[PDB]
Design an enzyme around this catalytic site. Structure first.
Site, PDB file in Angstrom:
ATOM      1  N   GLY A 143     -40.617  55.502  26.234  1.00  0.00           N
ATOM      2  CA  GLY A 143     -40.082  56.806  26.592  1.00  0.00           C
ATOM      3  C   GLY A 143     -41.038  57.520  27.526  1.00  0.00           C
ATOM      4  O   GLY A 143     -42.032  56.940  27.970  1.00  0.00           O
ATOM      5  N   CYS A 144     -40.746  58.782  27.827  1.00  0.00           N
ATOM      6  CA  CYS A 144     -41.623  59.567  28.690  1.00  0.00           C
ATOM      7  C   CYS A 144     -42.844  60.082  27.925  1.00  0.00           C
ATOM      8  O   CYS A 144     -43.807  60.559  28.527  1.00  0.00           O
ATOM      9  CB  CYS A 144     -40.856  60.730  29.336  1.00  0.00           C
ATOM     10  SG  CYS A 144     -39.821  60.250  30.752  1.00  0.00           S
ATOM     11  N   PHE A 145     -42.804  59.972  26.600  1.00  0.00           N
ATOM     12  CA  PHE A 145     -43.888  60.486  25.765  1.00  0.00           C
ATOM     13  C   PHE A 145     -44.708  59.402  25.051  1.00  0.00           C
ATOM     14  O   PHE A 145     -45.702  59.710  24.393  1.00  0.00           O
ATOM     15  CB  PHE A 145     -43.356  61.507  24.750  1.00  0.00           C
ATOM     16  CG  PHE A 145     -42.517  62.595  25.362  1.00  0.00           C
ATOM     17  CD1 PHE A 145     -42.877  63.174  26.567  1.00  0.00           C
ATOM     18  CD2 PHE A 145     -41.375  63.045  24.725  1.00  0.00           C
ATOM     19  CE1 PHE A 145     -42.107  64.173  27.132  1.00  0.00           C
ATOM     20  CE2 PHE A 145     -40.603  64.049  25.284  1.00  0.00           C
ATOM     21  CZ  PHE A 145     -40.971  64.614  26.488  1.00  0.00           C
ATOM     22  N   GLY A 146     -44.305  58.141  25.181  1.00  0.00           N
ATOM     23  CA  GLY A 146     -45.042  57.061  24.550  1.00  0.00           C
ATOM     24  C   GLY A 146     -44.255  55.781  24.349  1.00  0.00           C
ATOM     25  O   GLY A 146     -43.285  55.527  25.062  1.00  0.00           O
ATOM     26  N   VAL A 174     -43.238  52.306  21.291  1.00  0.00           N
ATOM     27  CA  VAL A 174     -43.143  51.889  19.904  1.00  0.00           C
ATOM     28  C   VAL A 174     -43.461  50.418  19.803  1.00  0.00           C
ATOM     29  O   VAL A 174     -43.036  49.629  20.642  1.00  0.00           O
ATOM     30  CB  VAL A 174     -41.747  52.145  19.317  1.00  0.00           C
ATOM     31  CG1 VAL A 174     -41.656  51.556  17.920  1.00  0.00           C
ATOM     32  CG2 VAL A 174     -41.445  53.655  19.303  1.00  0.00           C
ATOM     33  N   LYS A 215     -46.042  54.303  16.616  1.00  0.00           N
ATOM     34  CA  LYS A 215     -45.564  55.175  17.672  1.00  0.00           C
ATOM     35  C   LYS A 215     -46.761  55.762  18.409  1.00  0.00           C
ATOM     36  O   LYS A 215     -47.634  56.363  17.791  1.00  0.00           O
ATOM     37  CB  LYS A 215     -44.700  56.288  17.086  1.00  0.00           C
ATOM     38  CG  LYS A 215     -43.876  57.041  18.104  1.00  0.00           C
ATOM     39  CD  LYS A 215     -43.155  58.211  17.457  1.00  0.00           C
ATOM     40  CE  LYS A 215     -42.513  59.111  18.510  1.00  0.00           C
ATOM     41  NZ  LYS A 215     -41.960  60.379  17.929  1.00  0.00           N
ATOM     42  N   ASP A 275     -29.908  64.537  13.633  1.00  0.00           N
ATOM     43  CA  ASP A 275     -29.475  63.339  14.368  1.00  0.00           C
ATOM     44  C   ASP A 275     -29.177  62.132  13.461  1.00  0.00           C
ATOM     45  O   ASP A 275     -29.476  60.993  13.799  1.00  0.00           O
ATOM     46  CB  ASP A 275     -30.463  62.957  15.491  1.00  0.00           C
ATOM     47  CG  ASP A 275     -29.760  62.292  16.686  1.00  0.00           C
ATOM     48  OD1 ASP A 275     -28.503  62.256  16.706  1.00  0.00           O
ATOM     49  OD2 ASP A 275     -30.459  61.794  17.602  1.00  0.00           O
ATOM     50  N   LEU A 281     -41.573  47.567  21.274  1.00  0.00           N
ATOM     51  CA  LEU A 281     -40.203  47.701  20.785  1.00  0.00           C
ATOM     52  C   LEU A 281     -39.350  48.656  21.624  1.00  0.00           C
ATOM     53  O   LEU A 281     -38.115  48.581  21.588  1.00  0.00           O
ATOM     54  CB  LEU A 281     -40.192  48.106  19.309  1.00  0.00           C
ATOM     55  CG  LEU A 281     -40.762  47.052  18.348  1.00  0.00           C
ATOM     56  CD1 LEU A 281     -40.758  47.564  16.915  1.00  0.00           C
ATOM     57  CD2 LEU A 281     -39.998  45.742  18.446  1.00  0.00           C
ATOM     58  N   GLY A 282     -40.006  49.531  22.388  1.00  0.00           N
ATOM     59  CA  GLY A 282     -39.314  50.460  23.269  1.00  0.00           C
ATOM     60  C   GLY A 282     -40.259  51.420  23.968  1.00  0.00           C
ATOM     61  O   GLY A 282     -41.447  51.449  23.655  1.00  0.00           O
TER      62      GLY A 282
HETATM   63  C1  LIG Z   1     -43.676  54.698  14.120  1.00  0.00           C
HETATM   64  C2  LIG Z   1     -42.818  55.866  13.573  1.00  0.00           C
HETATM   65  C3  LIG Z   1     -43.298  57.199  13.781  1.00  0.00           C
HETATM   66  C4  LIG Z   1     -42.543  58.333  13.312  1.00  0.00           C
HETATM   67  C5  LIG Z   1     -41.302  58.157  12.634  1.00  0.00           C
HETATM   68  N1  LIG Z   1     -40.655  59.329  12.147  1.00  0.00           N
HETATM   69  C6  LIG Z   1     -39.403  59.442  11.578  1.00  0.00           C
HETATM   70  O1  LIG Z   1     -38.636  58.494  11.405  1.00  0.00           O
HETATM   71  C7  LIG Z   1     -39.022  60.785  11.023  1.00  0.00           C
HETATM   72  C8  LIG Z   1     -38.036  60.889   9.949  1.00  0.00           C
HETATM   73  C9  LIG Z   1     -37.694  62.179   9.405  1.00  0.00           C
HETATM   74  C10 LIG Z   1     -38.345  63.367   9.940  1.00  0.00           C
HETATM   75  C11 LIG Z   1     -38.043  64.764   9.394  1.00  0.00           C
HETATM   76  N2  LIG Z   1     -37.441  65.736  10.344  1.00  0.00           N
HETATM   77  C12 LIG Z   1     -37.027  67.064   9.730  1.00  0.00           C
HETATM   78  C13 LIG Z   1     -36.687  68.082  10.856  1.00  0.00           C
HETATM   79  N3  LIG Z   1     -35.709  67.470  11.861  1.00  0.00           N
HETATM   80  C14 LIG Z   1     -35.327  68.427  12.905  1.00  0.00           C
HETATM   81  C15 LIG Z   1     -36.042  66.085  12.375  1.00  0.00           C
HETATM   82  C16 LIG Z   1     -36.362  65.136  11.193  1.00  0.00           C
HETATM   83  C17 LIG Z   1     -39.322  63.238  11.007  1.00  0.00           C
HETATM   84  C18 LIG Z   1     -39.658  61.972  11.532  1.00  0.00           C
HETATM   85  C19 LIG Z   1     -40.801  56.808  12.406  1.00  0.00           C
HETATM   86  C20 LIG Z   1     -41.531  55.686  12.868  1.00  0.00           C
HETATM   87  N4  LIG Z   1     -41.031  54.409  12.604  1.00  0.00           N
HETATM   88  C21 LIG Z   1     -40.372  53.657  13.571  1.00  0.00           C
HETATM   89  N5  LIG Z   1     -40.098  54.148  14.836  1.00  0.00           N
HETATM   90  C22 LIG Z   1     -39.405  53.363  15.746  1.00  0.00           C
HETATM   91  C23 LIG Z   1     -38.957  52.062  15.375  1.00  0.00           C
HETATM   92  C24 LIG Z   1     -39.231  51.614  14.036  1.00  0.00           C
HETATM   93  C25 LIG Z   1     -38.887  50.259  13.517  1.00  0.00           C
HETATM   94  C26 LIG Z   1     -38.138  49.279  14.295  1.00  0.00           C
HETATM   95  C27 LIG Z   1     -37.882  47.968  13.785  1.00  0.00           C
HETATM   96  C28 LIG Z   1     -38.379  47.653  12.479  1.00  0.00           C
HETATM   97  N6  LIG Z   1     -39.097  48.602  11.733  1.00  0.00           N
HETATM   98  C29 LIG Z   1     -39.355  49.881  12.198  1.00  0.00           C
HETATM   99  N7  LIG Z   1     -39.973  52.414  13.201  1.00  0.00           N
END
Ligand SMILES: Cc1ccc(NC(=O)c2ccc(CN3CCN(C)CC3)cc2)cc1Nc1nccc(-c2cccnc2)n1
EC number: 2.7.10.2
Length: 261
Positions: free
Chosen positions: A20-23, A25, A39, A130, A17-18
């Site tokens: 980056g420099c760290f991995g 998706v 991820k 963000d 799905l995409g």
């Molecule tokens: C695979 C994965 C791993 C980690 C995350 N993490 C987050 O989404 C997330 C959300 C909130 C926080 C909380 N945090 C508090 C502090 N501040 C500074 C940052 C946010 C942290 C991580 C999402 C995913 N899911 C993900 N990632 C990329 C694409 C998609 C995706 C694309 C298409 C259809 N379905 C899902 N799904």
């Protein structure tokens, strides 16, 4: 060991799905039955514990409008697994084939869901940093969830945060107001024609985006409260949620459909 751990064999990576420099998706399947987003961590790019920080956070968060962690594989190569959202990013969804059919009613309901998710973040005393359409995922039935793909987004960032590093839930509220403009313009970049530099000069001088075409003034008013110079002047996500949930009864009861909104 940890109850989130899953055997490697239980995860299948089906579509990239995409990157980056760290991995990377991927979309995939967990236990041959559950569709998931995955991820990965590139071994050699970033320290495991620094990467698993995100998973540690995601273990303590649970809400129907937050993307839900499902499982992890915490020895390199690392995998983080969450629920899959069928429509992909809110941003992609807004500007693609679906976008032409969305009107104020769906768009405000999406906003209310996002504010609901952010209201949980608010109660939990976290900050997002963000919030924007690119970090919103959409599922079946116009379900919207907040995510953070770890993707400077000056145009979405409150001035006090961009300038002085003061990132609070109140700078999240400012971002939400910018997110309101993405919703009502079908995913257009904010401050059209202006680069980062003029955005910062202009906003500091008190300039604010105008009411988008066909957007009720009352909704642009709300955007403007989200953009109050003084962070403490901005509304809570609790308020934003309630205002958007009631919008078509309390605020805009005479609403009539239009060409685009
Ligand atoms: C695979 C994965 C791993 C980690 C995350 N993490 C987050 O989404 C997330 C959300 C909130 C926080 C909380 N945090 C508090 C502090 N501040 C500074 C940052 C946010 C942290 C991580 C999402 C995913 N899911 C993900 N990632 C990329 C694409 C998609 C995706 C694309 C298409 C259809 N379905 C899902 N799904």
């Amino acid at each position: 060991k940890d109850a989130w751990e899953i055997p490697r064999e239980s995860l299948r990576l089906e579509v990239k799905l995409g990157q980056g420099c760290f991995g990377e998706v991927w979309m995939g399947t967990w236990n041959g039955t559950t569709r998931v987003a995955i991820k990965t961590l590139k071994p050699g790019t970033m320290s495991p514990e620094a990467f698993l920080q995100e998973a540690q956070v995601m273990k303590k968060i649970r809400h129907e409008k937050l993307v839900q962690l499902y499982a992890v594989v915490s020895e390199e190569p690392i995998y983080i697994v969450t629920e899959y959202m069928s429509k992909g990013s809110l941003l992609d969804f807004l500007k693609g084939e679906m976008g032409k059919y969305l009107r104020l009613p769906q768009l405000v309901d999406m906003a209310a869901q996002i504010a609901s998710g952010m209201a949980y973040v608010e109660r939990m005393n976290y900050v997002h940093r963000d919030l924007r359409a690119a970090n919103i995922l959409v599922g079946e039935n116009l379900v919207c969830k907040v995510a953070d793909f770890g993707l400077f987004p000056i145009k979405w960032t409150a001035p006090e945060a961009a300038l002085y590093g003061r990132f609070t839930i109140k700078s999240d509220v400012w971002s939400f107001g910018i997110l309101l403009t993405e919703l009502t313009t079908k995913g257009r970049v904010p401050y059209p024609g202006m680069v980062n530099r003029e955005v910062l000069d202009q906003v500091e001088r008190g300039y604010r985006m105008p009411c988008p075409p066909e957007c009720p003034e009352s909704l642009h008013d709300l955007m403007c409260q989200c953009w109050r110079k003084d962070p403490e002047e901005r509304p809570t996500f609790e308020y934003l949620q309630a205002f958007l949930e009631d919008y078509f009864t309390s605020t805009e009861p005479q609403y009539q459909p239009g060409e685009n909104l």
